Design a binder for this molecule. Structure first.
Ligand SMILES: Nc1ncc2ccc(OCCc3ccccc3)cc2n1
Length: 172
């Protein structure tokens, strides 16, 4: 049915978390009327909650830090669903600090997952996909659930600008 069944839980969760961390967050939900199979509605909640929490906690910076960096004091967190053909696309986008791709590469080298010699030409997708590696509620589990639903997940991010996580599910 409508994804609002999941999305309606989130405003109070988001607001509670932002408050606790001295963040002002404009949380915008779009496409809440988007319908898809009830299995997906029943299961996508916990993964989305992790992404929202990540954005508030790790993404959106404290107001003082936003001001210091010359960003709007209020951060923006957008949760959207839409139809794209026979798939539904769910996006979680924030205008926070972004994911530090350099830090990912440094850790992958440290963990012996890649050699330094390969770092210079790694694609952005290949870098950000290390986030799904176990040990790198967890981001690994987010991907495992999405893929159990025959979905896919990708991440785009730019330092200091923010992060967008995209989930594609079938309508099934
Ligand atoms: N939206 C956003 N913005 C900045 C981030 C910066 C780092 C990031 O990973 C580290 C935190 C993490 C914990 C447990 C499982 C997965 C990831 C995630 C981030 N996400």
């Amino acid at each position: 049915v409508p994804i609002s069944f999941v999305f309606n839980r989130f405003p109070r969760m988001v607001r509670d978390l932002a408050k606790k961390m001295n963040k002002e967050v404009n949380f915008i939900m779009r496409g809440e009327d988007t319908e898809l199979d009830r299995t997906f509605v029943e299961e996508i909640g916990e993964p989305l909650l992790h992404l929202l929490r990540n954005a508030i906690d790790h993404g959106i910076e404290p107001k003082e830090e936003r001001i210091a960096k010359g960003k709007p004091p209020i951060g923006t967190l957008i949760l959207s669903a839409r139809h794209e053909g026979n798939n539904v696309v769910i996006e979680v986008e924030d205008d926070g600090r972004g994911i530090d791709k350099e830090k990912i590469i440094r850790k992958a080298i440290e963990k012996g997952l890649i050699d330094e010699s390969k770092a210079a030409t790694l694609s952005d997708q290949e870098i950000l996909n290390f986030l799904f590696v176990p040990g790198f509620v967890g981001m690994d589990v987010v991907k495992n659930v999405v893929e159990s639903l025959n979905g896919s997940i990708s991440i785009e991010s730019e330092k200091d600008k923010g992060t967008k996580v995209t989930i594609r599910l079938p309508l099934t």
